[PDB]
Each structure stands twice: as C-alpha cells, then as structure tokens.
Amino acid sequence: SELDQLRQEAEQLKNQIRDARKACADATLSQITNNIDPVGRIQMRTRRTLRGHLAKIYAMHWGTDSRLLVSASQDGKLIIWDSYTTNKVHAIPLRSSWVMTCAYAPSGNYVACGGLDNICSIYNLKTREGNVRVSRELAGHTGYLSCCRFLDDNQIVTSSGDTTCALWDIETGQQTTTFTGHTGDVMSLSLAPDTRLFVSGACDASAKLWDVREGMCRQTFTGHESDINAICFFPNGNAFATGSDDATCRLFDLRADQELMTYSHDNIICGITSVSFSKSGRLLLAGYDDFNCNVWDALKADRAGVLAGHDNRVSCLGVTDDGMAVATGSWDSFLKIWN
Amino acid sequence: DQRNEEKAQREANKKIEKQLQKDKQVYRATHRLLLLGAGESGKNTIVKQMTSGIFETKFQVDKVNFHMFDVGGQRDERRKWIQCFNDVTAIIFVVASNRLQAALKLFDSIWNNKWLRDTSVILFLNKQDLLAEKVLAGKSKIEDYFPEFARYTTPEDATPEPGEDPRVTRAKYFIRDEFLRISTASGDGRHYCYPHFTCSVDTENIRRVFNDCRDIIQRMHLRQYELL
C-alpha cells in the first residue's frame, strides 16, 4: 500500500549508493602498500601491572598527559591508576554496582561512569575538601549506558541501550541533541581529534557518522556481519576501523565512504572487544575473547605480534596520547601496561 | 621535592588499600541474585516478600546478606547486558502461567550462554493458583500449546497439597520436567537448576532461596577439591 513505494525507493537508493562505491573503487589499499617493506615482528613486553580490583573490568580511558587512567568494575569502584608508579590515586565508591563504561576528561578534572542504572554520573576530582562526590546525575535515557566520551567541561556524548545517542549538558541536566537512527544497541563510540564528528557502532552491524552541531547521521558505514563492540578513529581523522563479534576488523574511510581492508585470521573465532590505533596509525591493536590481544599492520594486514599477558577475556584497551605504551584490562580484575 | 609527593602517593595508596580490604570483607559475605522474569510474570509479589532501571533489595535472613537485583526499567534485548551477571550467586527465574514457550526459549539461551556456564538458576513457578483454575475450568488448556501433555505421566515422587485435582499436579510436574530437560541437556556439573512452586499467598519464598543458595555455595566448594 503506502510502505511499498517507500521501501522500493529506499532499496533503489542502496543500489545506486553501492554502485557509486564500486565506481570510486579501483585499487585496493592492500595492493598500494604491496611494494612497502613490512614491519615483520615487534617485541612488546609487559611493563607495569595493577592489582587493585575485585570484580571484572569493563572499560578504561587514558589521559591527555598519558599519566593516569580510570577503570570501572562491578564492585562499584572507580580507580584512577598511576601508569608509572603503580599507585592508586582515587577510589570512588559508586552508588550502583553495574557500571559498564568510564571516561576520562581531557582537562583531567572530571570522570564518567554508566551502566544498568541508566544514569551517567559525572564525578568531580578538584573538589574543595578532597572528598570526591557526584556532580550531575544525567537521567533521561531509557536503557543501559554502554559508552561515553567527554567533549568539554559541560558537554558529553553518551551511548545508551535505547538505540539513541544524546549530547548532554552538565550543570543543566537537559539533553541538547539526540542522535537517532540506529535500530540496535549502540555499544561504543569514538571522537575525532576535532570535537566536531564522532562515529557510533551499534548492534545492527553498521556504524553511523554523526555531527555534533546539526545532530544527525551524516554517513552510514556498513559491511560487518554481527554486533559492533568497539570503534576508533584514525589519527588523521579521515578513516576509522572497528571490530565486531564476527572476528573481523574492517577499516573504513570517511571520504571514500567504503571499507579499505579487513583484518582477520582463520583460527580466530572470538569477537573483538576493543580496538585502538598507534600515533602514526601503522599498528592496529584489537582485543579478543580468547584471553589475549593482537597487533595488526593497518597497511598490509599482517599480524606483527600477539600480546598474551592476561588470563581472562580482555574488555578494554587503549594507546596513550603520545603512543608510548598501551594498556589493557580484562575480566580477571587485572590491569596491565604493555610497551 | 619528588620524595614528598611520592610519600603522599604511598600514604594515599595504603588508605585506599585499607578501604578496599574493608569493602571486600563486606562484599564476599553478600550473595548477588538476579531476579529475572517475563512480561507480567508477577515478580513484584516476590519483592513484597523482601526512571531507574535497577532495583536493589538487601534483605537479610539467618544473618546472611542477600542482594537481589530487579530488571524492571530495561528493554527486551537481553543479549548485551546479561553478561554482567556471570558472577552472581544465582539467577531467580519467575514464570507466570504462549507465555510458557517464551520462558523456556529464554531459560535455554541463558543456560547455553558462553559466559553464563557457571551461574545457577533458581525457578519459581508463579501463578500456581490461577493455573489450577485454568486447567480445571477448561477455557484454555495447555493441550493447544503442548500436545505432548496427554502422553505425559505423573511421576511417583509427586508431593501435592492434599485435596487437589491430580491434573494440576500433573501440569505442575510437566512444566518442571520441561525446564529440567533443558538444564540437563547442557548440564556439565558447573551449574544446576532448582525448580520450585509459588502462589500469591506463599510466605516461604525467602526460605526456598536460602536453601537453594546454600546448596550452590556448598556444591561449588566440592568442585574445588574435585570431590564431585
């Protein structure tokens, strides 16, 4: 009746877009870097180990100074670790006990947390008497919080379980812009180094490029086959790669609006939990559920090394702001620093 | 200098480690329970026995701390957030009496989940009194949903309430065998099932959970010594 011409028009739009992608696709990136000396093997060993968590760790985040890192666990605690001296700086007792993500503000004054409580709690560090308390309880989401990233001292984008991302406003509690369009639970999102664009990967096997100012999906990136668990931007800002539960990592390009290379292996069945990029972008680190991570060459799809320091499945990892080292957290309540 | 700041971090670390020990002492003495139910399963009646998406009831019985967690406030997609309950003591499942096939296809996915292979499930068949009048009146028998109920036989170990139609006892044990055959289909000794029965006026629900949770902790200790 009425849904016929709308679905048929939506179908034709997908074919002409697919034809436009193949029309602008002539040489694969794998063939371009074929005449380049590969890196080969890299010798990365564990440097620091953290032993101050009880329950499994979900997410973590580094800092702009590459000094501290915050992590969350089911015990209801937020520990701001010291990456050099292995000294705990803060221990925030959470009211809830099902936190699923955490974030570190670029200024180093605020931290984030969220989970099954459907409330994103911002904790201020530079308080008056040194007692860390909650600043604003961002309520309004109709689902569990999956990931969040700070933008400024009063702006933060959250990705809840109601297939909608919201640009909150601290000190006011009212949502400024809500990003809708996903049909699945958004799991993780990454921010470009311009605070203007961000991509969100949901459980519908598609990553949508959003705009912070206007507030709608600018571009839609497809190609995956299962739920997307993580996503990360390329350092230059014109590309990004993501992982899913199909044990494949695909690198997409914003300007080309299509994938460039796939990073996967035959004997890898476990899904990717977290992804990260190096400073130069040559190395691609992706976590897995088989209790160890991997390092991939982002230009030739060669596995440069396997990092197997953890005992349980890894759930979060990230390269420092200067790329000197990379941390990794797993479900064994243990955090490690790899370099 | 750097010695003063480093000493401040050492003092702050020991203060946190002291708080981590004090909180770990009160955390290992509590048992986390996931109260999960279907749509209109009547799990709020169990809460009476002692927006936001999680409800916590810290009811204590026999000087033992129990921490229940309600699901009300979340969505129907239980794929990504069910992984958060791989460390709880047990998952309390409530079934209200096709609302039965949906309960058996969810209990099946939880039992076969790769991260929930060591979490035990406690069952509580709610709406027993209404289930008795539904099969007695015959307006909607379980025969249309399950045609195998006619071929089922009542087990000899049935302990029904005196003065009840054995058809209700046959229906209760048929639902129990349906959930048990799913649990023992992939049961490798890491986690077992504890089916029970509950009505709208039963007051011994906290004692059933206490006896079920006692069996779980008592059985997992036997696996540490490889006695089982």
Epitope: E225 | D76, E77, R78, A102, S186
Partner: nanobody
Amino acid sequence: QVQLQESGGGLVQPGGSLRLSCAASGFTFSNYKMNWVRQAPGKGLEWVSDISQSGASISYTGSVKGRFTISRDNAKNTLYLQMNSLKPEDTAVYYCARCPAPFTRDCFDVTSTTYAYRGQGTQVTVSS
C-alpha cells in the same frame, strides 16, 4: 550489509500446504544459527523453529511441532520452511530471524520486537 528477504506466503486454504524461502546475503550462512519467529495479529511475537549450523539440532515449538519442516543450504545461503495441514489459528506474518553471534549455542533477542537481524517477513492469511 545484512539483508534477509522472505519469499512465498499468501492466501491458502485450511488444510493445505505452503513454503517460505528466506534468501540471505551480506554474511556467511555456514557460521550463524538461524531461527523462525511469527507475530500473531494483535499479539506479541512468537518463536516458531530454529535450525543448527549443519541442520543437526532441530527444535520446533509445541504448537507446530512435527507439523512444519525446515531446511537450510549453506552453499546457496537460502533457508526453507515447509508447512503441512495449515490451520486458521496460524494466520500471521513470519519473520526470518538470525541470532547475532556466530558459533554460539545461545540464541538471543529473536522474539524482541526491535531486532535488526530479521527481514520484513511475508504475511500468511488462512481463510475461505
């Protein structure tokens, strides 16, 4: 881009036969467990059947157990659903659902009303 298109279905006489074909694309058919789900008019979604990776583990719901027949072809990426002796109570739209993670015994969110890994389905009506 995961795409699931269902074929067949329509007005069928009571006691007849019907067949539904589920064409799959955008993923490897030999790695994901497939399911079936129906939505009765004015009622919530109801699970129908499911098939394992190689078609070994087959399970049906009690309403249509033994009555229906399912089969999959990994080389063609096409799913089949056979119906025999249709009843006036089975009139509903049938969706071709696939639970997300590959090589997993669990199979979640098939019955949920907001699921991305399932097609628009085909309406099946049984009347005179």
